[PDB]
Structure 1
Amino acid sequence: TLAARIAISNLHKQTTKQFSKVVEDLYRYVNAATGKPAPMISDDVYNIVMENKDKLNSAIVYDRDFQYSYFGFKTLERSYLLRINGQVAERPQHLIMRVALGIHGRDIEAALETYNLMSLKYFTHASPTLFNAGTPKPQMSSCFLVAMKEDSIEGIYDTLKECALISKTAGGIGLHIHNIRSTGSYIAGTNGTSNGLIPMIRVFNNTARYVDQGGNKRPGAFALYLEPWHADIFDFIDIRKNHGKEEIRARDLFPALWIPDLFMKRVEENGTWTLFSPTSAPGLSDCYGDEFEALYTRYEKEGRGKTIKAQKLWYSILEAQTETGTPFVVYKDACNRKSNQKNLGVIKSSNLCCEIVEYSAPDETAVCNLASVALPAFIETKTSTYNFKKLHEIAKVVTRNLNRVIDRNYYPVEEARKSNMRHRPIALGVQGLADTFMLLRLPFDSEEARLLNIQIFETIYHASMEASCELAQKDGPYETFQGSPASQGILQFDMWDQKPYGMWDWDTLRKDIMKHGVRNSLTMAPMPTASTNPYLLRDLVDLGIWDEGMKQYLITQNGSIQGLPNVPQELKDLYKTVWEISQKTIINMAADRSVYIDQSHSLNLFLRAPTMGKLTSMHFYGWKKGLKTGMYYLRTQ
């Protein structure tokens, strides 16, 4: 809350009054230009709004529209509030109210609370849910994880279809392509050899550009997952390279390596690494860990690839990350080993923010159905505690919300719908970790921010897990739960090798889960969000120093306050810069919260003058650390 809150209330003035009418407007709307009935509300939902209009308008509390961050509102106005004809036809509460209804049909009770919590900034869904929830094509889902359906032209162009047919509504896409042959591999049609990936990519990077004015975003953030033994690996990690004068100016593709441990082994024990066109080495992206090392090992034996210094790739890879900050690294074995869907098959890729990790097949495209809970709004008392009951509580709710989405979602491609339906993956997220910390005035390093951390996720996983049981208790287990690690009482940390930090009763849980099942194969995918230092500001009053006599140190420096004349230790330990905090503490809290995460989540370790040898300790640290999504991003300068 700053001095520009006028943009809220004075533009709470060009807004009409009663939810009901605003819906009417939106429902009844017409294309003032083509005279086309252009509704922005589904028949289905509209009637629900009319049938209840009374209790609804009543229910809303418009005073809550002032309880919004300055840059926050702007976001909504610019992009989330349904406009009428160029003009904003939605008070934030309306949006909320339409989202709330979006999710539950006749479940008005459910609608109303899942209303209130939202309005009381407790949690919020993903843009996709925000944007379309309630409207005629209620696509509320975030990303899609697409499988390169075949290594035939029929395949590629059937894949290319989706990557558009989705890309046209929807959100981010991440497709894995370990099965397309390598440069100069062999066509059994004619005298041709293979073009490779990179031109085939230039293709996908191109439907990307064109298919967009509808996907309501030129940003075509596609990410491409590929195992590092593919004979085309080098050209692949290179994509975004600042040079390439007839190449991929792939300003919207990003390359992600889907890395088995073998590679990281070879690398460390400085050795060999063999490459393959997949055609000569079949079945490779289908085995993993041991089954995979037997396999790969033997195609080396059998002499099918092109042996290189394992240290060569790793070396080039590194170079690329620095110059471009890509490829991303996800650990193939870390992920499958510790996935609850290991029963289905082999998870071949994760997604752009290298967060969700769920099965995909040429006839299953996986979805990111996600909401994210606002960690800071459970802080409670001058100095304070955190309400873990409230947490458990709210996160029980969201797990319900998200489940619904899975049923009321508008599916872009039949694949998507099969997938989401048999497996029911959710993704609870979280916002405000860094905050919560600073509010409870704990420094990022505290071996008690350390503590807090663990407990939080512990509680979320705990709740989501339980909520999911009851609905599986009410509605039946998700369709494919048998064979599940959970179908045998093995849980996230159990697959890591730990004991819960025990703040919740996992026995009673693990007990019922076997007895009732759960409504979803996965539950949480924490922190790769923004729209889905201000903290000093406050503190500097009580001690001293200020404004006219101090438009100085920080305007200059990046909120890096270590060693500033007249400023407390308590503070410059709390309000630590991100370069300033220890990475092996970040990697660490990471691998901590990691134990109660069905999915994965992403690191962005933040060093200064990173060495082809520093970066390496960082990757190997986390690597060795059991982590699922490797180091995902390194920011430099």
Structure 2
Amino acid sequence: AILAARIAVSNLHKETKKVFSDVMEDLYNYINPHNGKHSPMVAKSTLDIVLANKDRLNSAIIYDRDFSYNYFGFKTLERSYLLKINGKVAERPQHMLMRVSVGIHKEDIDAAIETYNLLSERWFTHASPTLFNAGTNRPQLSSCFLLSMKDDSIEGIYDTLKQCALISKSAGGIGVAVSCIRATGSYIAGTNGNSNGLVPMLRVYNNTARYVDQKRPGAFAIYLEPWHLDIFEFLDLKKNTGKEEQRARDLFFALWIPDLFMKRVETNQDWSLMCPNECPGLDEVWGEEFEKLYASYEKQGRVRKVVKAQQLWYAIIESQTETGTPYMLYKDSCNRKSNQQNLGTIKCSNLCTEIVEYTSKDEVAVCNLASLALNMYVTSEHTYDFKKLAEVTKVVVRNLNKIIDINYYPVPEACLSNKRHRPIGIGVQGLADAFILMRYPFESAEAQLLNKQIFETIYYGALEASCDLAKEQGPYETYEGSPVSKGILQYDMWNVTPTDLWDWKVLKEKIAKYGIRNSLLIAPMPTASTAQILGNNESIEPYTSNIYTRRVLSGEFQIVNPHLLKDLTERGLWHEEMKNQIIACNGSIQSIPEIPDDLKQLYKTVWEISQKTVLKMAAERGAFIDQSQSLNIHIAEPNYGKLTSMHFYGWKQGLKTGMYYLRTR
């Protein structure tokens, strides 16, 4: 299990060259056998730099560090992350890592080697696209894009479609605000007919996601505000039951929900469905300005239908019960608590619901992501190295900022947006793993403090780097007029006062003289592929299991949690019988009578951990997060009241993203 990883790392080493620069030459020199077309697999510019510096570069690589990958982490590396020559891997992990670092840092060889070390030791990681394409010809290094529908017209709709198509091709995830498109049955002046509405146009988007699928199908998340008249239909179209023309199951679904709707639901008032043609401008305002405008149309009776707000609500909950979706975002908090509110109202988040960025017809938002491994900063004295964490966080910020400049953009609107506001999104993995390492259960008061200190540190480290860059490079163009320019920082907009761990007075004074380089910095994302690679538990998120199991070609694996295992082995209580005992407990200790009630607390599973405390923790770290978090909700046995109970708590806590996916048993 641990051994098979050693073998597979060694075989690979046996079947690839050892010299980094010589591997780079082979990739660059690659020739299409069918064709004779010289089809370089790294950019020439990267290779020149490598060859000009081959002694430092080749020498700096430490191939011991290939052996840090666990088995399935490695297999995944070999399947998608290591460049192949005619179906044979050419690249060692270390080789790809060096490629990524030279690819980001170019001629600054010091900066490159620091990054290689940091990466190769697994202090952090860049997201998959940037691992895939750094050091490569016309390299698309960004994970996600967000789009506001261009125009409420066929010219507009198919223009956006082409953008989504081009972004899909280049490996971008998409989030799209569709709320301006006019409702089913609304009048069309120039042809004197009526709109077929949202469903039939989303059907075209759905086929486009299927068609442009380079190996998972294209991923588009569609954003609807609940005042729009097609809402009930929009909740139907994910479901596995019903008419084909009424469905779009390859798409993803999210609600961009105003405060006003939530208040109507709890007070049990009436909700007014509208058409954006009839009642324009609702998505371009938020909070009180929205509510005044929403009320205005309502007093005029420009209202296509009215319903019990509690009727919509039930429609949403059954969707989540059946489908796991839609995602729950609160437009008012997102807008209220944004360093970008400077630029206008923000109409959607992205595919994974952690990114909150402005878009318009001239602007497709982007975000480059990397993630810090939180387990990494636990000392052997069970101390947490906040100083180090901020050390590494500052590197990441600079890297991500370098990415903005060298990225190749699939559409010009995205280039403009990204160099205008220079947002980035740093996230995390192994938040659970850190806790176990510090001997804190997830729900303990110590974990709840740690949680805040970690995210205070990262946000502190981040701003501090961004600040230095504004020193060297200057502020981003739209810095002036922003909350941060006005001395307001993210915790201030949540009305929180930081722990005394870091001196914000200093920083708020550094930022006042120089400004910052990046409009936004922090956004915990899902990390599904990158956490499996590095063997850390997903982003935030309690441990799912003490046991991970997998049927492979040569039978099965049953990998007990490494953190648990070292501890039972130590407190000499480990047995092979306990392995099969756990499986019956579906991942859980708690039942096994032979195990310490101290350990049992520490390795409690996700299905056995308070979702309220989860929400409370998101909210507490949320105050140190510029953007949002891809927060799943685990409720084994859902019902109407539970989900309702959960959503309102999330909302009242002031979460920008109340729920990402709903997971059940």
Give the drift of 1:43.
2.0
> Is residue 2:624 matched to residue 1:596?
yes
Q: 1:483 aligns with which of 481, 484, 491?
A: 481
> Is residue 2:490 matched to residue 1:499?
no
Aligned to 2:653: 625
> Is residue 2:194 matched to residue 1:196?
no
Unaligned residue ranges in structure 1 (runs of 5+): none
Confirm or deny: 8 A CA contact 1:329 1:629 kept in the other structure.
yes
Give, in whole Å, the separation in 1 of the partners of 2:35 and 2:237.
43
> Is residue 2:127 matched to residue 1:126?
yes
Aligned to 2:316: 317
Q: Which amino acid aligns with 1:344?
A: L
> Is residue 2:67 matched to residue 1:78?
no
TM-score, structure 1 normalization: 0.98
Aligned to 1:36: 37
Unaligned residue ranges in structure 2 (runs of 5+): 531-545, 547-560
Instruction: State the Cα deviation string for residues 524-566 of structure 1 (Å, max 9, x = none).
Output: 1014222232132222223444445444211222221213221
Give, in whole Å, the separation in 2 of the partners of 1:388 and 1:500.
15
Give, in whole Å, the separation in 2 of the partners of 1:193 and 1:575.
58
Give, in whole Å, the separation in 2 of the partners of 1:580 and 1:431.
20
Give, in whole Å, the separation in 2 of the partners of 1:238 and 1:69.
41
Give, in whole Å, the separation in 1 of the partners of 2:580 and 2:125.
37
Confirm or deny: 8 A CA contact 1:239 1:255 kept in the other structure.
no
State the SS of the aligned residue for 1:7. Answer: helix
Give the drift of 1:248.
5.2
Aligned to 1:12: 13
Q: Which amino acid aligns with 1:89?
A: A
Q: Which amino acid aligns with 1:478?
A: Y
Q: Which amino acid aligns with 1:83?
A: K
Which has a greater percent of strand?
2
Compared CA separation, residues 26 and 186, structure 1 to 2 (3 A) = same
Give, in whole Å, the separation in 1 of the partners of 2:229 and 2:577.
62
Aligned to 2:152: 151
Q: Which amino acid aligns with 1:335?
A: C
Aligned to 1:262: 260
Q: How does 1:105-184 map to 2 (within 5 A)?
A: 105-184=106-185
Aligned to 1:338: 337
Give, in whole Å, the separation in 2 of the partners of 1:554 and 1:471.
51
Instruction: State the Cα deviation string for residues 50-75 of structure 1 (Å, max 9, x = none).
Output: 11112110111111111112111111
Give, in whole Å, the separation in 1 of the partners of 2:80 and 2:363.
31
Aligned to 1:2: 2
Compared CA separation, residues 303 and 441, structure 1 to 2 (3 A) = same
RMSD: 1.2
Give, in whole Å, the separation in 2 of the partners of 1:190 and 1:48.
59
> Is residue 2:326 matched to residue 1:327?
yes
Give, in whole Å, the separation in 1 of the partners of 2:250 and 2:567.
41
Confirm or deny: 8 A CA contact 2:237 2:249 kept in the other structure.
no
Aligned to 2:587: 559
Give, in whole Å, the separation in 1 of the partners of 2:622 and 2:374.
17
Confirm or deny: 8 A CA contact 2:259 2:332 kept in the other structure.
yes
Give, in whole Å, the separation in 2 of the partners of 1:43 and 1:91.
20
Give the drift of 1:581.
1.0
Confirm or deny: 8 A CA contact 1:336 1:342 kept in the other structure.
yes
Q: Which amino acid aligns with 1:559?
A: G
Aligned to 1:536: 564
Q: How does 1:96-495 map to 2 (within 5 A)?
A: 96-212=97-213, 216-247=214-245, 249-305=247-303, 306-381=305-380, 383-495=381-493
State the SS of the aligned residue for 1:371. Answer: strand
Give the drift of 1:11.
1.5
What count of residue pairs does the alignment treat as equivalent? Answer: 633
Q: Which amino acid aligns with 1:238?
A: D
Confirm or deny: 8 A CA contact 1:240 1:248 kept in the other structure.
no
Give, in whole Å, the separation in 2 of the partners of 1:77 and 1:542.
34
Confirm or deny: 8 A CA contact 2:265 2:309 kept in the other structure.
yes
Give, in whole Å, the separation in 2 of the partners of 1:561 and 1:14.
42
Give, in whole Å, the separation in 1 of the partners of 2:635 and 2:391.
37
Q: 2:640 aligns with which of 603, 608, 612?
A: 612
Give the drift of 1:349.
0.3
Instruction: State the Cα deviation string for residues 63-118 of structure 1 (Å, max 9, x = none).
Output: 11111121111111000001111110100001000100111121111011011111
Give, in whole Å, the separation in 1 of the partners of 2:280 and 2:206.
26
Give, in whole Å, the separation in 2 of the partners of 1:344 and 1:44.
37
Q: 2:523 aligns with which of 512, 525, 540?
A: 525
Confirm or deny: 8 A CA contact 1:602 1:630 kept in the other structure.
no
Q: Which amino acid aligns with 1:570?
A: D
Instruction: State the Cα deviation string for residues 242-277 of structure 1 (Å, max 9, x = none).
Output: 212223553321110000000000000001111111
Identity %: 67
Give the drift of 1:137.
1.8
Which has a greater percent of helix?
2
Give, in whole Å, the separation in 2 of the partners of 1:25 and 1:395.
34
Confirm or deny: 8 A CA contact 2:167 2:173 kept in the other structure.
no
State the SS of the aligned residue for 1:501. Answer: coil
State the SS of the aligned residue for 2:239. Answer: coil
Q: Which amino acid aligns with 1:207?
A: T
Compared CA separation, residues 549 and 255, structure 1 to 2 (3 A) = closer
Confirm or deny: 8 A CA contact 1:221 1:352 kept in the other structure.
yes
Aligned to 1:51: 52
State the SS of the aligned residue for 2:375. Answer: coil
Give the drift of 1:458.
0.1
TM-score, structure 2 normalization: 0.94
Compared CA separation, residues 432 and 549, structure 1 to 2 (3 A) = closer
Q: Which amino acid aligns with 2:3?
A: A
Confirm or deny: 8 A CA contact 2:487 2:512 kept in the other structure.
yes
Give, in whole Å, the separation in 2 of the partners of 1:133 and 1:146.
25
Give the drift of 1:143.
0.7
Compared CA separation, residues 397 and 276, structure 1 to 2 (3 A) = same
